[PDB]
Design a protein around this ligand. Structure first.
Ligand code: CLA
Ligand code: CLA
Ligand code: CLA
Ligand code: CLA
Ligand code: CLA
Ligand code: CLA
Ligand code: CLA
Ligand code: CLA
Ligand SMILES: CCCCCCCCCCCCCCCC(=O)OC[C@H](COP(=O)(O)OC[C@@H](O)CO)OC(=O)CCCCCCCCCCCCCCC
Ligand SMILES: CC(/C=C/C=C(C)/C=C/[C@@]12O[C@]1(C)C[C@@H](O)CC2(C)C)=C\C=C\C=C(C)\C=C\C=C(C)\C=C\[C@@]12O[C@]1(C)C[C@@H](O)CC2(C)C
Ligand code: SF4
Lengths: 70, 201, 217, 41, 709
């Protein structure tokens, strides 16, 4: 009723959030990072999309290393 | 610069300088303004032309021999319904795997040329081709016709491309003829030749 | 030169370079101000000439089958009026060696070749004699004037060697074209009103002039 | 052309394509597994 | 850089005057935009015509108009939403439409679904043609400025050609197609046996059998023996007993006369040939007794500005739309429209809202012209200057009238309510205690009833049946039209209408007059047409611009229009609509309670809002449940609008600051800095949601109520 669909929603929402967070970090180093938020770099975005499959492991490892929080 | 154009008296586009084989300055929509788009579209056209020659000869030749009375093979339209030793999905999977290896090798060749020119397991054997899309080598060019003076290569590639365009048109025509009239392509030709004036719509 | 309903505005730009110019332009369509689209004096003159030539063909062509049919020169099966020869299927049809639509496609293909070549010559001059066209490109070069191409293909008899003769012949051509366009308009209106062939209309009028007029119809 | 790709990557058009594909997918599951309240797996 | 750029991008998309300062380019852009709008309208018409051919019960309705509900929409069965496919009759299931498209098609002579398909294809072709024409006339052949400023030729063509020839062509179509087919339909002939329209044109004895005058041909027209055409060109008046609409012969004669009049009127203004007047000469030479100098200088103003012309056209179109809404319920022009109550209520409410919106737009664009294009140095006009030189007297007098009307129209309701509450019913303003009779309207009604036979010898009946003295009309057991009584209850509501209209006029006119400058801010012209304020100085200068005056006037327009439609709905449900038994006894839907209950505010809350809303709130589980769902959704939008109207900008900017800190904490900070909405944008968002919620609530309430009963 609630437990099984809850974990699925958490996984999907974490996927979406991790993809969105990873896209912003990639373009932050550019000279005009604001231009990439309007005209989406599709070739760059397609590569990051597959990386959200392993978001739990990625976030678990990044939290331990200390790179999660600025 | 002075080569024949598709529309005589018109101005050809600036990105078609006639260097490529089979070039007639036909691109009104400008679908290949960028160099990468040009290369990708050229490869797509070459592959389509070769698959068309392969398929077109396999559709009209069997039907010609069937109608002339030599064989009894069924119509190409209904060839997917005949009996076979195994389910068609298994055949589809085997075909997918084999063509997947082949097309993956070809894809690796397009992006980074010269990266797949050596045999993975027998390093002695190589491929001698130099341009993308024309592998050459003993596997694909046994008779040595793929190398020579640039004029001969340009002429041969031009004639291959023109034959391919004709084959693609013919294959689409066969498909639509059989969807419309409901009979074999050869029967349509014989009906047209019997009475050219009236046997159309 | 004679003037026909000429006006001060129209006389300003219609100097007289065009053949058969009478100064007649009450609406001022060919005014050189605000020229755009297809409203351009050169294009208007070209269109008038081409329409005149086609009208001079059609005016004789529509009435030719009826002329000979009464004289017995042709079989009665082909002595049809201009609106019963398959152009309008509801009004009647004739069975040729092929149905009407394949004839339409063949006509469209051939005249598409011809008219596209003519248009390409109109846009840029002299470019129809450069690309190889079955070795016929030598004679299709044109003469710099879109409406009078000249050359061996279009002027085989060598008429108008002098400029004066050419001008007189051009004037006569444009007059005949205007008359033919009026005749074709009369053809259409008579066919729509009376319902018979134009030659039949002329014969009926000649038989009893006091009766077969517009007033009775 | 390049301008065709650049206009296609702008935020509104890309978002509309993504949401249309999403709605089609969601309707597909709702049609394939209708009237669902609990996971039977 | 920031997020306000995205909002600013869509705000100035169609402001061509800001992009360029050249009149030629603005004119060309306007021409192309008009072409695009025409293309969209044609596409909409094509969709409407196609849907009625494939997904409608038009034929079954045509075989039995009274007992079958029209329908043209069908729903897919995906998430259980197929419950909206009700049983509308005719062996069809779908959503019942209220746009009155079936009546138009029947009055045009359409009998089968093959003609609708052809019309849809033609409309699609026309839409493509219009789109191509727009592209061509902007990018290939763009006209010059001198072409647009030839207003003498534009008026001639738009009067003689667009309006003069359209009426004549429609009269021809009516005479040749609509009259015989409708005569056959009204005779009980089955629709599939009626001859095709072209048989009447091709075969003439068929037309001669129905109308003998068609045997004489066109000779009586040329011989001036026009009395022979009286068979299908009549001057009867009144409604058709069989169908309940106006006689089609009257419509044909009316369109012929209108076409001739417009064609005559289109030959007035001077052109290249030197016959006719010039507009500039008419304006200049006109000097009556009180104007003095005259209207010298308006030609340049109206030929060098697009906003003045837009304002004038918007005002005229809004007034015309309101007149159209009033003139269609009392003189139904289509067959089987009066007795179909759902469509009658929907057509009156649509055009009222459209007219109100267009009027407010006229006011806004007049203010824009005053702010931007006004030029006393190069474009001096005397009358505008004199109006601007005594604007204090105009506003102060208009302010007084509003107070007087409000007091003497609302205090009467409050006095009635108090007297009723105190148990003193003999002291109220009603038909039994203290009468305030609308004597002038009753005199007008009597005069119009008695006009036929005395002042209109050619008329056989009155123009409409609302004027008391006529006879009841019944079609299929329902009431179509009957005289409408006027009493004390109708005296108060008319003055309510007057009060609301006057207040709206006061707001809009004050904004327009004080757009340029005022005693508070002398340099208000330099600040612009659309600016929030001028700071907290002078005690506070919030909403001093003309844009804010239009923003305030929208609320009052919405308030004024809502009372009109409620008045119409209750008065028609209580006094006209109903049913008739076999013996001739009329039973109205609400039984005539408007006379006594509509004099106190409690009567509108209990007898109208409470009693008539039971249909929408009980629609759950039935085919009308979409109206019940839209009823609740619109309240949410209306209440959601209040967040933007009541609050300010600083609080939300600080909240967004905290949110941005929390985002920065996790390296998910966007490079486009979030910004709260501007002061002007926050106002525009609130009023949009307010109007949407109110209008949607009223729409759902009306549609759910009138379909059920
Ligand atoms: C009209 C048909 C036509 C023509 C004229 C050519 C002509 C050519 N092909 Mg070719 N080809 C065709 C159909 C055709 N092909 C089809 C249908 C296929 C798919 C089965 C191929 C697959 C193919 C490959 C894979 C290669 C060629 C190559 C070549 C070139 C040298 C090889 C050769 O012809 O010697 C006979 C051997 C030559 C220009 C070779 C090339 O250009 O590289 C050197 C090469 O590697 N072709
Ligand atoms: C190689 C191209 C080719 C050829 C030779 C033919 C030949 C033929 N088609 Mg056909 N066809 C084609 C392409 C072609 N088609 C394509 C691409 C389509 C899909 C649009 C069709 C759709 C089609 C239908 C629906 C029908 C035919 C029919 C026929 C036969 C009667 C002729 C006719 O009415 O055709 C009319 C052909 C067209 C309307 C298509 C236009 C022609 C294409 C574009 C090729 C252009 C001409 C080509 C450049 C000429 C050079 C090659 C030359 C050596 C032949 C005839 C044997 C009819 C049939 O069965 O006969 C009884 C029939 O009913 N065709
Ligand atoms: C409000 C609509 C509108 C307006 C004001 C204009 C105005 C103009 N157009 Mg135009 N046009 C329009 C719509 C409009 N167009 C549409 C919808 C098309 C179709 C794409 C065109 C295509 C067009 C072309 C191709 C050209 C113009 C041109 C012009 C300019 C010169 C016109 C002239 O001198 O008369 C010339 C008038 C005639 C020669 C008479 C033609 C009479 C037509 C053929 C009769 C129409 C029959 C009609 C369909 C009957 C309906 C029957 C019923 C069944 C529907 C002028 C500024 C010309 C120009 O130079 O642009 C600056 C030009 O070349 N227009
Ligand atoms: C000797 C005189 C003569 C005769 C007998 C005909 C006879 C005919 N012409 Mg014709 N024509 C003539 C002179 C003549 N033409 C001239 C001088 C011209 C102008 C150059 C034309 C231009 C013309 C056109 C444009 C057309 C005909 C067509 C026709 C045919 C239509 C009648 C029918 O049933 O078929 C008919 C055979 C029509 C046809 O279908 O031809 C087969 C047609 O479209 N004619
Ligand atoms: C502004 C005009 C307008 C509007 C509001 C609609 C609205 C609608 N049409 Mg529609 N239509 C229109 C014009 C319009 N049409 C025109 C001009 C044509 C061509 C003549 C059609 C042809 C058409 C067909 C053939 C069908 C609809 C259907 C529908 C309904 C479902 C739409 C859908 O699933 O889209 C999905 C989203 C897309 C982008 C497509 C919807 C009520 C469908 C329907 O009612 O099925 C029950 C249906 O089958 N329409
Ligand atoms: C622009 C509109 C228009 C058009 C195109 C036509 C067209 C036509 N009318 Mg007509 N007509 C019209 C308006 C029109 N009418 C009006 C307004 C009246 C009322 C005075 C008439 C009264 C009328 C009569 C009385 C007759 C026609 C007839 C005709 C036809 C023969 C000419 C023709 C189809 C004649 C007919 O039926 O011919 C078959 C005929 O006898 N018309
Ligand atoms: C013929 C009609 C007409 C025309 C041509 C114009 C033209 C113009 N008006 Mg205007 N106006 C009109 C009628 C018209 N108006 C009416 C009737 C009113 C009264 C309400 C107004 C009130 C008005 C104001 C108050 C202002 C203008 C302004 C302007 C100018 C800029 C418009 C702009 O940028 O819009 C851009 C377009 C938009 C912002 C789109 C609006 C979207 C609406 C509000 C939401 C609709 C919700 C919809 C139902 C749901 C869709 C959901 C979907 C998104 C998922 C432009 C010259 C402005 C101006 O000149 O300022 C200097 C200005 O401030 N007009
Ligand atoms: C992928 C981008 C992204 C990420 C990782 C976050 C993450 C967070 N937001 Mg947030 N937010 C976003 C976008 C994002 N937001 C956008 C676009 C908006 C504007 C609509 C907001 C508005 C917002 C508010 C108002 C608040 C947060 C809050 C929070 C925090 C609480 C957790 C949460 O889910 O809140 C719930 C978050 C939401 C409900 C936002 C809606 C989700 C949007 C629609 C997803 C958009 C994804 C976007 C399209 C990415 C495209 C990727 C593509 C290029 C590949 C968390 C750190 C809260 C907080 O702790 O204070 C800061 C809080 O109060 N957010
Ligand atoms: C006073 C009754 C209206 C008299 C009338 O004709 O009104 C209109 C009139 C102005 O008319 P104009 O001089 O603009 O035009 C007169 C026409 O005959 C020719 O344009 O104003 C006055 O005469 C006084 C207005 C006093 C303020 C009236 C407020 C309402
Ligand atoms: C691509 C194609 C059509 C081409 C389209 C064109 C001209 C587009 C042109 C333009 O872009 C340009 C140039 C420039 C732009 O500005 C304008 C346009 C106009 C847009 C046809 C065929 C394309 C594809 C072809 C030929 C497919 C071949 C199919 C085969 C091999 C089938 C094999 C079998 O038949 C056998 C042998 C036996 C059977 O039993 C089983 C099966 C499997 C059925
Ligand atoms: S900040 Fe707000 S309240 Fe203060 S003057 Fe400006 S608009 Fe008015």
């Amino acid at each position: 009723e609630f437990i099984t669909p809850g974990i699925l929603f958490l996984y999907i929402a974490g996927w979406i959030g991790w993809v969105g967070r990873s896209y912003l970090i990639a373009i932050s180093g550019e000279k005009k990072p604001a231009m990439k938020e309007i005209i989406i770099d599709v070739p760059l975005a397609s590569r990051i999309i597959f990386r959200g499959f392993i978001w739990p492991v990625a976030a678990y490892r990044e939290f331990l290393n200390g790179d999660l929080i600025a | 610069p002075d080569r024949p154009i598709w529309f005589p008296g018109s101005t050809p586009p600036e990105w078609l300088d006639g260097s490529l084989p089979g070039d007639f300055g036909f691109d009104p929509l400008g679908l290949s303004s960028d160099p990468d788009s040009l290369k990708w579209n050229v490869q797509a056209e070459i592959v389509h032309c070769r698959w068309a020659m392969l398929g077109a000869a396999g559709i009209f030749i069997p039907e010609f021999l069937t109608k002339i009375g030599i064989l009894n093979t069924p119509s190409w339209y209904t060839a997917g319904e005949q009996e076979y030793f195994t389910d068609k999905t298994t055949l589809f999977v085997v075909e997918l795997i084999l063509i997947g290896w082949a097309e993956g090798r070809r894809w690796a060749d397009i992006i980074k040329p010269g990266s797949v020119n050596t045999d993975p397991v027998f390093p002695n054997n190589k491929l001698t081709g130099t341009d993308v899309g024309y592998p050459g080598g003993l596997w694909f060019d046994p008779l040595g016709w793929g190398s020579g003076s640039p004029a001969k290569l340009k002429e041969l590639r031009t004639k291959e491309i023109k034959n391919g365009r004709l084959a693609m048109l013919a294959v689409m025509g066969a498909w639509f003829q059989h969807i419309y009239t409901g009979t074999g392509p050869i029967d349509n030709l014989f009906a047209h030749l019997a009475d050219p004036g009236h046997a159309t719509i | 030169r004679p003037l026909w309903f000429a006006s001060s505005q129209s006389l300003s730009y219609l100097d007289g370079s065009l053949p058969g110019d009478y100064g007649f332009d009450p609406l001022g369509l060919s005014d050189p101000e605000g020229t755009g689209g297809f409203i351009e004096p050169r294009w208007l003159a070209y269109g008038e000439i081409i329409n005149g030539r086609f009208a001079m063909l059609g005016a004789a062509g529509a009435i030719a089958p009826e002329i000979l049919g009464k004289a017995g020169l042709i079989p009665a099966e082909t002595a049809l009026p201009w609106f019963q020869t398959g152009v309008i299927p509801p009004a009647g049809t004739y069975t040729y060696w092929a149905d009407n639509y394949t004839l339409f496609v063949l006509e469209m293909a051939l005249m598409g070749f011809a008219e596209h070549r003519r248009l390409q010559d109109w846009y840029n001059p002299g470019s129809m004699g450069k690309q190889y066209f079955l070795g016929l490109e030598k004679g299709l070069a044109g003469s710099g004037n879109p409406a009078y191409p000249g050359g061996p293909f279009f002027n085989p008899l060598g008429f108008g060697k002098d400029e004066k003769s050419l001008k007189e012949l051009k004037l006569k051509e444009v007059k005949n074209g205007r008359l033919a366009m009026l005749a074709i308009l009369g053809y259409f209106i008579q066919g729509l009103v009376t319902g018979v062939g134009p030659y039949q209309n002329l014969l009926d009028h000649l038989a009893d002039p006091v009766n077969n007029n517009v007033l009775t119809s | 052309m390049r301008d065709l790709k650049t206009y296609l990557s702008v935020a509104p058009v890309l978002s509309t394509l993504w949401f249309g594909s999403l709605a089609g997918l969601l309707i597909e599951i709702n049609r394939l597994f209708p009237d669902a309240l609990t996971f039977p797996f | 850089d920031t997020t306000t750029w995205i909002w600013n991008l869509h705000a100035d998309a169609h402001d061509f005057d800001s992009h360029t300062s050249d009149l030629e380019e603005i004119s060309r852009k306007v021409f192309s935009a008009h072409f695009g709008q025409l293309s969209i309208i044609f596409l909409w018409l094509s969709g409407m015509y196609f849907h009625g051919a494939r997904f409608s019960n038009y034929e079954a309705w045509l075989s039995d108009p009274t007992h079958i509900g029209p329908s043209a929409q069908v729903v897919w069965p995906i998430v259980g939403q197929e419950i909206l496919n009700g049983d509308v009759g005719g062996g069809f299931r779908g959503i019942q439409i209220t746009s009155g498209f079936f009546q138009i098609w029947r009055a045009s002579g359409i009998t089968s679904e093959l003609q609708l398909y052809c019309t849809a294809i033609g409309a699609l072709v026309f839409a493509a043609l219009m789109l191509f024409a727009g592209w061509f006339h902007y990018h290939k052949a763009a006209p010059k400025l001198a072409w647009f400023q030839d207003v003498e030729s534009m008026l001639n063509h738009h009067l003689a050609g667009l309006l003069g020839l359209g009426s004549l062509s429609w009269a021809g179509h009516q005479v040749h197609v609509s009259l015989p087919i409708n005569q056959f339909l009204n005779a009980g002939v089955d629709p599939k046996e009626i001859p095709l329209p072209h048989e009447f044109i091709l075969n003439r004895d068929l037309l001669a059998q129905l109308y003998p005058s068609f045997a004489e041909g066109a000779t009586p027209f040329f011989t001036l023996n026009w009395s022979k055409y009286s068979e299908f060109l009549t001057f009867r008046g009144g409604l058709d007993p069989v169908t309940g609409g106006l006689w089609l012969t009257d419509i044909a004669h009316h369109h012929l006369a209108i076409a001739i009049l417009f064609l005559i009127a289109g030959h007035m203004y001077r052109t290249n040939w030197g016959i006719g007047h010039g507009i500039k000469d008419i304006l200049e030479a006109h000097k009556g007794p009180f104007t003095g100098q005259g209207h010298k200088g308006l030609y340049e103003i109206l030929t060098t500005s697009w906003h003045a012309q837009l304002s004038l056209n918007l005002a005229m179109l809004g007034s015309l739309t309101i007149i159209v809404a009033h003139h269609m319920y009392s003189m139904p022009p289509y067959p089987y429209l009066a007795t179909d109550y759902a469509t009658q209520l929907s057509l009156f409410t649509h055009h009222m809202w459209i007219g109100g919106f267009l009027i407010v737009g006229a006011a806004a664009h007049a203010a824009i012209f005053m702010v931007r294009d006004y030029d006393p140095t190069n474009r001096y006009n005397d009358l505008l200057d004199r109006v601007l030189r005594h604007r204090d007297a105009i506003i102060s007098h208009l302010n007084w009238v509003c107070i007087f009307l409000g007091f003497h129209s609302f205090g009467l309701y409050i006095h009635n309510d108090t007297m009723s509450a105190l148990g003193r019913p003999q002291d109220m303003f009603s038909d039994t205690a203290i009468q305030l009779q609308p004597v002038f309207a009753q005199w007008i009604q009597n005069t119009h009833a008695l006009a036929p036979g005395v002042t209109a010898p050619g008329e056989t009946a009155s123009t409409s049946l609302t004027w008391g003295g006529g006879e009841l009309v019944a079609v299929g057991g329902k009431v179509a039209l009957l005289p409408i009584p006027l009493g004390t209850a109708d005296f108060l509501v008319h003055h309510i209408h007057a009060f609301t209209i006057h207040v709206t006029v006061l707001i809009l006119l004050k904004g327009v007059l004080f757009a340029r400058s005022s005693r508070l801010i002398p340099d208000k012209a330099n600040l612009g047409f659309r600016f929030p304020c001028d700071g907290p100085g002078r005690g506070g200068t919030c909403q001093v611009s003309a844009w804010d005056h239009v923003f305030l006037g929208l609320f009052w327009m919405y308030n004024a229009i809502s009372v009109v439609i409620f008045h119409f709905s209750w008065k028609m449900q209580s006094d006209v609509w109903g049913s008739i038994s076999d013996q001739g006894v009329v039973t109205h839907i609400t039984g005539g309670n408007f006379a006594q209950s509509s004099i106190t505010i409690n009567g509108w809350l209990r007898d109208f809002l409470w009693a008539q809303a039971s249909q929408v709130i009980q629609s759950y589980g039935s085919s009308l449940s979409a109206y019940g769902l839209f009823f609740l959704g619109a309240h949410f939008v209306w209440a959601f609008s209040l967040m933007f109207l009541f609050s300010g900008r600083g609080y939300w900017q600080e909240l967004i600051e905290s949110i941005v800190w929390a985002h920065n904490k996790l390296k998910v900070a966007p490079a486009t800095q979030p910004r709260a909405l501007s002061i002007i944008q926050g106002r525009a968002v609130g009023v949009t949601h307010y109007l949407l919620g109110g209008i949607a609530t009223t729409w759902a309430f009306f549609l759910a109520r009138i379909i059920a009963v």
